Amino acid sequence: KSPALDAVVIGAGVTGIYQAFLINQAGMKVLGIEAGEDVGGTWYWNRYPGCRLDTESYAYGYFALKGIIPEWEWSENFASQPEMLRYVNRAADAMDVRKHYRFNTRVTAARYVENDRLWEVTLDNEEVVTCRFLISATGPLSASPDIKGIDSFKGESFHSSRWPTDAEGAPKGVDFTGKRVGVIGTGATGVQIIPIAAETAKELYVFQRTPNWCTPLGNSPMSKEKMDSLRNRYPTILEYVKSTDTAFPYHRDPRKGTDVSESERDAFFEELYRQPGYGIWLSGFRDLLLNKESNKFLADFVAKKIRQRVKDPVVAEKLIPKDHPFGAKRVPMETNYYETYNRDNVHLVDIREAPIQEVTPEGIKTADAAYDLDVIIYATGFDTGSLDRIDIRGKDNVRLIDAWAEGPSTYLGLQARGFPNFFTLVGPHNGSTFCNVGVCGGLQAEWVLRMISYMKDNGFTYSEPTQAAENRWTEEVYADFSRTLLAEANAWWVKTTTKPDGSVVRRTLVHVSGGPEYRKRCEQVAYNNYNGFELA
Amino acid sequence: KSPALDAVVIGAGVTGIYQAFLINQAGMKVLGIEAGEDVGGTWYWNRYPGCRLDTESYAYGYFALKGIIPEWEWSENFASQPEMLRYVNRAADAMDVRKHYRFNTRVTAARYVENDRLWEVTLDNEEVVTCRFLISATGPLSAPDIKGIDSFKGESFHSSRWPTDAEGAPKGVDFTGKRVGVIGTGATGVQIIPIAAETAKELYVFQRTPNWCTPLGNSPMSKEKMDSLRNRYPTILEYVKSTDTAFPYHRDPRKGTDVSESERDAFFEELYRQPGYGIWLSGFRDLLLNKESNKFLADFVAKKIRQRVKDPVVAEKLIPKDHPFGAKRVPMETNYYETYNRDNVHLVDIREAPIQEVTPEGIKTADAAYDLDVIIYATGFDTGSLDRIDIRGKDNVRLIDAWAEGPSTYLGLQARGFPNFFTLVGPHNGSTFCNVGVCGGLQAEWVLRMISYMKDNGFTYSEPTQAAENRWTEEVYADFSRTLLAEANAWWVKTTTKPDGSVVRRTLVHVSGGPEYRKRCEQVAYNNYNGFELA
Ligand SMILES: Cc1cc2nc3c(=O)[nH]c(=O)nc-3n(C[C@H](O)[C@H](O)[C@H](O)COP(=O)(O)OP(=O)(O)OC[C@H]3O[C@@H](n4cnc5c(N)ncnc54)[C@H](O)[C@@H]3O)c2cc1C
Ligand SMILES: Cc1cc2nc3c(=O)[nH]c(=O)nc-3n(C[C@H](O)[C@H](O)[C@H](O)COP(=O)(O)OP(=O)(O)OC[C@H]3O[C@@H](n4cnc5c(N)ncnc54)[C@H](O)[C@@H]3O)c2cc1C
């Protein structure tokens, strides 16, 4: 049998809708599927107070850089969620892409049918569509707590992954006047929520096990003159972000930390720290993430600034990580976060030394005290992937989740052996963790378009990585990872298995190779007739 | 005073015409100047028999890849000069670029007017045109001192100016009944020699020392293949934009010394028989970094020459002993070695017996006299294309004097002393080992972006700072020094001892990978052209 569609794209975040647009544009039959009511992905689902980009708006706005909505005007240097959603909606208007999508629809299963070289996609556990190619754009991140009696709390509970919204689409109940509020989690979302909650809360208790390194965002409104000169510079901006390791508008200093004196370093860090955006991390010395000494130079500088900004030295010290290097995790940026602790009604609770024994009807119970609360905010982190919710079955009925149980195994981060004609766009296993996804995801969608077109042009109906290509690729991805500070720092990012026979397999959950070098490899493969893929 | 033009572009080869096209398309006023009649540059001036690409036609044809002439059809895998000239003509037609050019016109001088931030450009030592920006696209290569050349009574042919018929094809390529001498076995000689031998009564090749050459493996391009190529143009473009040379090849990730002798030989045998430059560009990653690895390949190619040339004494005179393989841009050949197997073809070693003079009757060497009906001077390449122009910067300094110790630039594009002046496509910015169809196109795009940024911001002055130029120029020498090229081509380095006794070394050749170099250029452009003072 022949499939009804050339492709199904799962997801209508920035990645999915661009893939669908490209495929329709090339004259092929695409159906998008989205669980929500409309486009946006991240920017549709996440509506908690202070939700905002870490990437310069202009750099994230690939659809404007690529001339799809070249006239777009950013109002802020780092756009809030509502502005981001307007951006994605405007892009979708211009792409005329909503008409290819079925919204309010979940893919629950997808099954490869060997004899027909197609995928059977089950929607909402009932209807089945068939496509030659299945393309996942289901999100590089998933909702992340492990404490008794959470459901027993009799006040208002808020979860940042599913913040309640009103009729407009704005967050519900962010006015905390008269309320004692407890926040669990000081990761990226916690450091955005904490300062805002503190504006109105009667009291605010922050339950922190271990701190993250955070740096100031430096956000400000975008003037008309800046926005115009940016747009005039788009051709250079595009070429620049295509050429940096992360696709952020930053590149590392060519010197090592020791190439300069303590005096120069301090002045260098001071200047970076006060500059809006990720410069402090991404413009740092070349060995920042390769050398413990070099990393300590910066980590000690950031500590110094945290002690400057927090008045109480006891509290200051609890906000400074002693257990991991700076820049081992996508660093959260913040707007007046550390200053929040200077408020009379803000209290830091160290739950490492006094762990939470249970959430109770009245609040939170640690080993050391009872906190009577009206509100608990679960400012919960991020990893388990977006694909696990789908029962994906490849050849011989193998489950993707079993295929990847000892860690992701792919060729080029895009296809897995066992699962022909299936592309996995934008995920930690192909570089989303440290990427400007706006740009990285766009370029990846373009590469997938070119492979599908090549197959169409050549009459190929089957693609699957060989065992050798997959194994070498995955080993090489791990080898890249292991040469950095991330490997010792993030233990859970490496799956180590000892096989029956006795071989030891090491795989990283997170691909950290530079984008340009990654894409150069992908073009080497594409030009040489998709070497490493069995095509038929 | 305000300049009449935003820019003057010197030259109508593929680089110049593209630059001029870009600037006019951006809505700026450009004037092109070209010494010749029409467009083509290389492909206009070089009309000798056997002239042909070393780069796969589809990969050189950036104008087809970029959608300027997307419908173009290559008739062979490595296009002959006549096909290339048609390519450039068709591109120029589609670009509507000839209307912006002065032809039959030679820039003789260019002077920077400091009070006015513009260039005065002198044409054929008479008319003066003014521009904000001067962009040289005068060619990555320029241009024999033998007593008595004018004394020969036979026919003399110079490869750089082969006479043409009315249809513009080489004249006098039938040597039936003629005794022919060819002086030189660089790129042009090895293209001319096998063709001359098809008809010559007798052929004498006057060779000082041999080059390394490899088989081109050229063949006609079928419609089927052309169409499949056109369909993958998006991929082909991305690939050539990401390889080190912009050729459609990338190095093997392994070091030569890491692969066994039997494997290596087999690897080399397959590449040797594959059309184009794979034997060099797809080779081991350390070919130009490790002497033992290079020697593996040089020994292999020598084994192939001994196989192809029947007489071992002649074969050995055709195998270089003085240099590593691939330390110069390697001439590719069509049946060149086999020419020497013919009974009427003779290799004359002029190292062993240098030429004394040309005489009315032929050539006299230290050893013998050769009676000839035809002499072909198949000349090679040194001096730069800019040397022919009297270029004066601030305080009336000559560019010749500013670059006397070697080229000194920022980003290979502008030189301190010479504001608003861009040098496109020359050995000092990567042309030697590049597919110039692509590298040059990309360079022109970068310069256009800089010029557009200046126009947007109202800047009328650009010049590299001393620190930027020095740092850049020193790095370029550093990368160069860590390759075999430093030992192999000693004349590619200028070593000056200054009056204070300090030693300055500059490379004449920039050898960084294209992608890396362009990344550096974008780092600069994004950061408001840091290292250029702009005003
Ligand atoms: C708060 C926050 C801030 C961020 N800030 C940045 C930033 O500044 N810079 C940056 O580069 N990245 C940032 N990101 C990362 C973000 O993931 C990417 O920028 C980008 O939004 C991901 O786009 P996407 O289309 O790949 O996936 P998503 O935006 O996650 O969209 C995936 C879509 O798939 C749908 N879906 C999933 N499964 C199914 C199914 N089974 N059936 C039907 N539909 C399904 C979901 O409903 C969702 O709409 C941020 C993420 C978060 C959460
Ligand atoms: C025989 C041969 C084969 C080659 N094969 C390849 C190949 O296969 N692949 C590859 O990448 N490269 C090859 N090259 C290199 C070649 O130089 C480039 O490919 C390319 O043609 C250079 O283009 P250009 O526009 O930069 O300069 P050119 O083509 O050299 O043109 C420069 C133009 O400037 C004009 N000019 C110079 N000075 C003045 C002046 N003062 N006033 C007015 N006009 C002036 C000249 O008349 C000329 O027309 C080859 C070169 C030669 C000689």
Task: Give the residue from B423, B425, B446, B440 showing the smallest Cα distance to B520.
Answer: B446
**How many Å apart are CA A248 and CA A278, to the nearest integer?**
8
What backbone torsions phi and psi does residue B104 show, to the nearest 5 degrees?
50, 35
Looking at the structure, do residues A185 and A220 belong to the same domain, yes or no? yes
Report how far residue A422's alpha carbon sits from residue A416's, in angstroms, rounded to the nearest whole number. 8
Q: How far apart are CA A222 and CA A224, in angstroms?
A: 7
State both tokens at B222: 């079928």
Q: Which residue has the tokens 């039938």?
A: B174
3-state helix, strand, coil in chain B (%, to 5): 35, 20, 40
Residue with tokens 């930390």: A257
- The answer to whether B423 touches B414, Cβ cutoff 8 Å, is yes
Q: Which of chain A's residues have a Cβ under 8 Å away from the Cβ of B242?
A: 516, 519-520, 523-524
Looking at chain B, the residues that come just before a C–N gap of over 2.5 A are 143, 382
In the chain, the amino acid numbered B255 is K
Distance CA A247, CA A56 (A): 11
Residue A86 shares a structural domain with residue A72:
yes
Distance of CA A522 from the midpoint of ligand 2 (Å): 33
Spatial distance between the Cα atoms of B326 and A124, rounded to a whole number of angstroms? 62
The owner of tokens 């040469």 is A483
Cα–Cα distance, A332 to A187 (Å, whole number): 7
List the single residue in A with minimal CA-CA distance to B224: A458
Domain end position, chosen among A353, A382, A411:
A382
- Position in ligand 2 atom list of the atom nearest CA B381: 53
Distance CA B134, CA B508 (A): 22
Ligand 2 centroid distance, CA of B43 (Å)? 7
Q: Could you write out the DSSP letters of every residue in B382-403?
A: ---GGGGSEEE-GGG-BHHHHT
Q: Assign 3-class secondary structure to B40-64.
A: CCHHHHCCCCCCECCCCHHHHCHHH
Q: Does B25 touch chain A (CB under 8 A)?
A: no
Identify the burial level of B316 via C-beta atoms within 10 angstroms of its C-beta, where 0-12 means exposed, 13-18 middle and 19 or more buried: middle
Provide the phi-psi class of A366: left if phi over 0, else alpha when psi is between -120 and 50, else beta.
Answer: beta
Together in a domain, A388 and A337:
no
How many angstroms away from the CA of B225 is the closest CA of chain A?
12
- Cβ atoms within 10 A of the Cβ of A333, count? 24
Interface test with B, best of A447, A521, A523 (most B CBs within 10 A): A523
For the CA of A388, the nearest ligand: 1
Nearest Cα residue in chain A from B455: A232
Final residue of a domain: which of B324, B348, B381?
B381
Do B134 and B168 lie in one domain? The reply is no
The alpha carbon torsion through A21, A22, A28, A32 (nearest 10 deg) reads -40
What's the distance, Cα to Cα, between the start and end of chain B in Å? 16
Q: Please report which residue ranges of A242-385 form alpha helices under DSSP H.
A: 262-273, 279-282, 292-309, 313-318
Coil, helix or strand at residue A446: helix
Distance CA B435, CA B41 (A): 15
Instruction: Tell me B440's DSSP state.
Output: H
Residue A523 is nearest to which of B231, B242, B525, comparing CB atoms? B242
Look-up of token digits 């452009």 = B525
Largest CA distance in chain A: 71
For ligand 2, atom 1, name the residue with the nearest CA.
B51
Mutation pick for ligand 2 pocket among B8, B42, B53 (CB with most ligand atoms within 8 Å):
B42
Nearest in space to B185 (alpha carbons), one of B305, B347, B326, B27: B347
Distances (CA, A) of A430 to A42, A153, A441, B4, B83: 18, 40, 10, 53, 44
Summary count for chain B: helices (H), strands (E)? 18, 22
Per-residue b or e along A79-101, where b marks 16 or more CB atoms closer than 10 Å to that residue's CB: bbbebbbebbbbbbebbebbebb
**Strand B30-33 relative to strand B101-102, pairing:** parallel
How many other β-carbons are positioned within 10 Å of the β-carbon of residue B473? 25
Q: Are residues A281 and A327 in contact, defined by beta-carbon separation less than 8 angstroms?
A: yes
Domain C-terminal end among A352, A382, A412 = A382
Contacts 24+ apart (CB under 8 A), B342-346: B342/B197, B342/B203, B344/B197, B344/B200, B344/B201, B344/B202, B344/B203, B345/B197, B345/B202, B345/B203, B345/B205, B346/B202, B346/B203, B346/B204, B346/B205
For A124, which DSSP code?
T
Do A278 and A412 fall within a single domain? no
Task: Provide the phi-psi class of A435: left if phi over 0, else alpha when psi is between -120 and 50, else beta.
Answer: beta
Alpha helices by DSSP H, listed for A26-80, are 42-45, 57-60, 62-65
| Residues B184 and B319 reside in one and the same domain | yes
Distance separating alpha carbons of residues A217 and A78, to the nearest angstrom = 8
User: B509: alpha, beta or left, given left = phi > 0 and alpha = psi -120 to 50?
Assistant: beta
Residues B359 and B436 in one domain: no
Angle at B133 between CA B513 and CA B523, to 5 degrees: 35
User: B240 CB contacts (<8 Å, ≥6 apart)?
Assistant: B59, B65, B246, B247, B248, B435, B438
H helical segments located in B213-327: 223-231, 233-242, 261-272, 278-281, 291-308, 312-317
For chain A, report the end-to-end CA distance as a whole number of angstroms.
Answer: 16
Give the best residue of B526, B527, B529 to mutate against chain A (max A CB count within 10 A): B526
Alpha-carbon distance B285 to B270, whole Å?
17
Q: Range of B535's domain?
A: 1-143+382-535
Residue ranges of the alpha helices (H) in B141-232? Answer: 187-196, 223-231
Can you tell me whether residue A134 is helix, strand or coil?
Answer: strand
- Residue B291 to residue B281: CA distance in whole angstroms: 17
Find the A397 Cα to ligand 1 centroid distance in Å: 28
Whether residues A247 and A321 share a domain: the answer is yes
Q: CB of B3 within 8 A of CB of B131?
A: yes
Beta-strand relationship, B101-102 and B369-371:
unpaired
The vertex-B498 CA angle with B493 and B504, nearest 5°, equals 30
- Give the method used: X-ray
Q: In sequence order, which residues have a C-beta less than 8 Å from that of residue B485 and are 6 or more positions away?
A: B288, B327, B492, B509, B511
CA atoms within 13 A on the CB side of A333: 21
B389: tokens are: 């122009």
Query: Is A349 found in the same domain as A251?
Result: yes
Q: Please state, in angstroms and rounded to a whole number, the distance separating the CA atoms of residues A165 and B285.
A: 58
* Experimental structure resolution, Å: 2.0
Alpha-helical regions (H) of B273-414 = 278-281, 291-308, 312-317, 336-339, 399-402
In contact, A205 and A347? CB cutoff 8 Å: yes
For tokens 């990338």, what's the residue?
A: B250
Residues A160 and A307 in one domain: yes
Please tell me chain A's helix, strand, coil percentages from 3-state DSSP, rounded to the nearest 5.
35, 20, 45
Element (H, E) at A244: none
**Are the CB atoms for B247 and B281 separated by under 8 Å?**
yes
The total number of structural domains that make up chain A: 2
Q: Distance between CA atoms of B340 and B197, rounded to whole angstroms?
A: 9
Same domain assignment for residues A126 and A10: yes
Q: Which ligand is nearest to the CA of A54?
A: 1
Interface test with B, best of A239, A286, A439 (most B CBs within 10 A): A239
Q: Dihedrals φ, ψ of A357, to 5°?
A: -80, -40
Taking CA atoms, B398 is separated from A486, B6, B135, B421, in Å, by 54, 23, 17, 13
DSSP A289: T
Residues A350 and A237 in one domain: yes
- Provide the phi-psi class of A125: left if phi over 0, else alpha when psi is between -120 and 50, else beta: left
- The string of DSSP letters for A256-270 reads -GGGS-HHHHHHHHH
- What lies within 8 Å, CB to CB, of A96 at 6+ separation is none
Q: How far apart are CA A186 and CA A190, in angstroms?
A: 4
- For residue B31, give the CATH number of its domain: 3.50.50.60
